[PDB]
Amino acid sequence: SHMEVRTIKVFTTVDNINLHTQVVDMSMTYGQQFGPTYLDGADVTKIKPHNSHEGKTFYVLPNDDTLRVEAFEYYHTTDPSFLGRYMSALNHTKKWKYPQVNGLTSIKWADNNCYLATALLTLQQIELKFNPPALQDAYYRARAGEAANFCALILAYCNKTVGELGDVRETMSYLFQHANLDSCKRVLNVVCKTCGQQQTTLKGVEAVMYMGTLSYEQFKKGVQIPCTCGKQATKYLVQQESPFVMMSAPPAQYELKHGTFTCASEYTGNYQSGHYKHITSKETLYCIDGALLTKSSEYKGPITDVFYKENSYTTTI
Ligand SMILES: [Cl-]
Ligand SMILES: [Zn+2]
Secondary structure, three states: OOOOOOEEEEEEOOOOOOOOEEEOOOOOOOHHHHHEEEEEEEOOOOOOOOOOOOOOOOOOOOHHHHHHHHHHHOOOOOOOOOOHHHHHHHHHOOOOOOOOOOOOOOOOOOOOHHHHHHHHHOOOOOOOOEEHHHHHHHHHHHHHHHOOHHHHEEEEEEOOOOOOOOOOOHHHHHHHHEEEEOOEEEEEEEOOOOOOEEEEEEEEEHEEEEEEOOOOHHHHOOOOOEEEOOOOEEEEEEEEOOOOEEEEEEEEEEEEOOOOOOOOEEEOOOOEEEEEEEEEOOOEEEEEEEEEEEEOOOEEEEEEEEEEEEEEEEEEO
């Protein structure tokens, strides 16, 4: 009653570069032989091999020491569910569209991906280099217009699934964690009429992000914050060394003035449902909303994040 054994050669991988020769029995599923298995994002764990699969590359989970090392070196994570979440996302993002809008790779709206579109548009306007080879390779392709792998990696690194509501500031925080910001430096001073003054120094990601005001000029002049004594103290920027800065705040009506910022994100909605748009300051003000594009000489809206150019700043206060 035994059926004659039939096999094909396939390759397994965790980085799509280093390949691992395998011989699979076509009477057993991929899952029975490799564990969870994916073909360009599609879950084929429960699929039995097809003749058309011969010679193709399948992603698997890091289930031996060689694969564990290859996966860490490429992705800089050892989260056991990472590859499954990346493939699950990729199965969707490979079907998204990535139109060039005003010279930048955007994303046509789908699956609540507006926060990803404005993040991707923002990255193309600031100086930033990623550390994991996976992000280096995928971001290069995204700049060229093939952003499916990059978007699926953002989702995996942020632990977001396709369709989940995302926050732009949080998303940028994750991407900045995987970028080389080592030389970025920020010095702050906080002045309380009662308690005196206290200087602090921040480095890396914390040197380029601030939550509380959208205006870089106001940050240099001073913003009011609580002091432990109960009074409000004044916090201001003393010194800044970085190629950009990111200023964030809860969404509030805010006026964006041409030539005074690099780009910004706008959020219309509430804590459960909303929509992001991107504003970029070039020869005029362009509003990029996924595949849509409009222009205006002035802009006012519920802004959440503003990016500014920088190199070296020292206060005169
Ligand atoms: Cl890079
Ligand atoms: Zn005080």
